[PDB]
């Protein structure tokens, strides 16, 4: 960075020019230049440049990414006074707590709401259960009741969590990374209702974000589910719309995820005291947030005094009400496993590829413990434990297994095609003489439209070796490139030294004639 100046990164979908305007007032009062940038994919650029010791002094992002930044020591701890904290709602400070330390200033509160077309539906439904009957009426007039993104679990979570689902359990100031709540009775009930909506044709499993927004903004559907970032496009569409509390399910509030847009101070910044003065005395004021909100709406805000003004707008009152009934997104790194696990579960349940129970059972284990890893779209790697979990194999679309062991059972014959490679995990086993047969089996399943799960006992030596051999042969790459590729995706792989020898010998066999092209 650079001393005596402040550099701020904030996403391009935010009021960055209102923020820049607050910086100019700071510069006018102090002489301290403030520069606001909005790089593409800044949430990925930040961890790279900040580990160097560069990047912005201040980064704005939803609080959930900030736990990962704080794990890598990329964010400075802040210690605002109790008199300052009391200016903000207590739950927003909770969202920026990591390992007992505050690591950002809360700014705004973001939650999904029910957006409805007042001309098609002057009185929006209080419950999810009445939406099928509403869709019957509207279909009779060439419209539909409800379209929203079914591809991303962020958007289906409010229904799934309503009756008791949750991501990670919080207790005693800490998330329990092994207590996931995606396969409890409440989550099953919510996803079961979502599947009923789809299988009965009230919604289409292929509706994504763009499809739902276009249909609502063209007056084709009476309702959507979306956040404050979408209001501008609706404003342009001139649809006469309202924003309200989400429907209940079994009488329980829908429980959307809550994101707190937050301002973290780079641990490498030489301007930490300046950043704190800017954030506490300039941004987190009625006038500062008003300047940002004018540019692009923040939704609800963390500052009590300004939230009370903004809440006169019912769209913002509704955002805050849905947030009160929601669940703060856990800020722990294990959430990346959660998002992938639950994304797969919802897509599989919405397409009928898995039952609700099996989809959520697989996602539960994936999020709380681990699971088989994708190597290529048709090739997956894991353990004998995974080979006993039909729900976890089905979740990946597995149609065939290579059992690379002498002892491990085949649990599901007649559901999957099995291939046996009977070798031991030791220095005497000749695994390379099975390479061609394994590769031919993988390609055979691949070209029939299937997917292969390769496993051993631990999924770290015999099965990893077969996957490495497949990659080297199919892509004409060296051991070191394939190994790094697989290690990146299943970090515990560790082929025994004899297998590594046999793979290096295979490498010179695969590439012996490659230098001519």
């Amino acid at each position: 960075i650079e001393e005596g100046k402040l550099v701020i990164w904030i996403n391009g979908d935010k009021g960055y020019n209102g923020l820049a305007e607050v910086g100019k007032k700071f510069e006018k009062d102090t002489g301290i230049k403030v520069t606001v940038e909005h790089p593409d994919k800044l949430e990925e650029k930040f961890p790279q440049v900040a580990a160097t010791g560069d990047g912005p002094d201040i980064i704005f992002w939803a609080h959930d990414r900030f736990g990962g930044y704080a794990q890598s020591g990329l964010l400075a701890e802040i210690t605002p006074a109790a008199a300052f904290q009391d200016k903000l709602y207590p739950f927003t400070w909770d969202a920026v707590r990591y390992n007992g330390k505050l690591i950002a200033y809360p700014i705004a509160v973001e939650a999904l709401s029910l957006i409805y077309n007042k001309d098609l539906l002057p009185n929006p439904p209080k419950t999810w259960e009445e939406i099928p009957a509403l869709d019957k009426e509207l279909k009779a007039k060439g419209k539909s009741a409800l379209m929203f993104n079914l591809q991303e679990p962020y958007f289906t979570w409010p229904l799934i969590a309503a009756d008791g689902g949750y991501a990670f359990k919080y207790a005693a100031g800490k998330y329990d990374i092994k207590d996931v709540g995606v396969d409890n009775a409440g989550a099953k009930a919510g996803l079961t209702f979502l599947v009923d909506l789809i299988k009965n044709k009230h919604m289409n499993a292929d509706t994504d974000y763009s499809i739902a927004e276009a249909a609502f903004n063209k007056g084709e559907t009476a309702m959507t589910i979306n956040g404050p970032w979408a209001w501008s496009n609706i404003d342009t569409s001139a649809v006469n719309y309202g924003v309200t509390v989400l429907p209940t399910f079994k009488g329980q509030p829908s429980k959307p995820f809550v994101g707190v847009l937050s301002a973290g101070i780079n641990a490498a910044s030489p301007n930490k005291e300046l950043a704190k003065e800017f954030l506490e005395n300039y941004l987190l004021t009625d006038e500062g947030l008003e300047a940002v909100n004018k540019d692009k709406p923040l939704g609800a805000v963390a500052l009590k005094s300004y939230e009370e003004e903004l809440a006169k707008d019912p769209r913002i009152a509704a955002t805050m009400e849905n947030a009160q009934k929601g669940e703060i997104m856990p800020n722990i790194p294990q959430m990346s496993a959660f998002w992938y696990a639950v994304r797969t579960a919802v897509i599989n349940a919405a397409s009928g590829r898995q039952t609700v129970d099996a989809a959520l059972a697989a996602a539960q284990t994936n999020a709380a413990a681990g699971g088989p890893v994708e190597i290529l779209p048709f090739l997956y790697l894991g353990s004998a434990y995974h080979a006993s979990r039909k729900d976890m194999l089905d979740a990946l679309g597995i149609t065939a297994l290579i059992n690379v062991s002498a002892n491990c059972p085949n649990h599901f014959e007649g559901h999957y095609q099995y291939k046996s490679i009977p070798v031991e995990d030791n220095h005497k086993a000749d695994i390379s003489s099975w390479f061609n047969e394994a590769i031919d089996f993988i390609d055979s399943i691949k070209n029939a439209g299937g997917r292969v799960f390769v496993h051993s006992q631990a999924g770290i030596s015999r099965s990893a070796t077969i996957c490495l051999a497949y990659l080297m042969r199919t892509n004409r790459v060296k051991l070191d490139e394939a190994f790094e590729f697989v290690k990146q995706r299943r970090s515990i792989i560790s082929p025994n030294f004899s297998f590594m020898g046999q793979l290096l010998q295979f490498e010179s066999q695969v590439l012996a004639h490659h230098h001519h092209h």
Binding site: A133, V195, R353
Partner: protein, 125 residues
């Protein structure tokens, strides 16, 4: 397969003649999508009496349960479709079949306010 998918769509959409054409050309009247939903399920849910009739005439399973436990009688009872319910029963629909919540068609009709149909179902065992 291909025709089965078109028959499912036409049964949902209420396209009488398309249903008949697809059936004449070999569409499985017991076709299933990934939810185990059949054309008779969709015709009953969406209120297409004539499509329900022709499907049953040519061998649609009146007691098929989809992957979630719903029978066609369950789906018709949700909306109080008395004509459809009557022809389902005539073809042997089981009034006592239970969905995934343990509810019969009678319970389902009350749960959606169709108590005129509940009164008729109550006299049946």
């Amino acid at each position: 397969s291909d025709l089965g998918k078109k028959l499912l769509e036409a049964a949902h959409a209420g396209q009488d003649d398309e249903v008949r054409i697809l059936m004449a050309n070999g569409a499985d009247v017991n076709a299933m999508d990934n939810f185990g939903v059949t054309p008779l399920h969709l015709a009953a849910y969406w209120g297409h009496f004539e499509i329900v009739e022709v499907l049953l005439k040519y061998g649609a399973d009146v007691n098929a349960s989809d992957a979630t436990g719903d029978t066609p009688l369950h789906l018709a009872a949700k909306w109080g479709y008395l004509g459809i319910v009557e022809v389902l029963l005539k073809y042997g629909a089981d009034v006592n079949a239970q969905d995934k919540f343990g509810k019969t068609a009678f319970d389902i009709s009350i749960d959606n306010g169709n108590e005129d149909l509940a009164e008729i179902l109550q006299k049946l065992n």
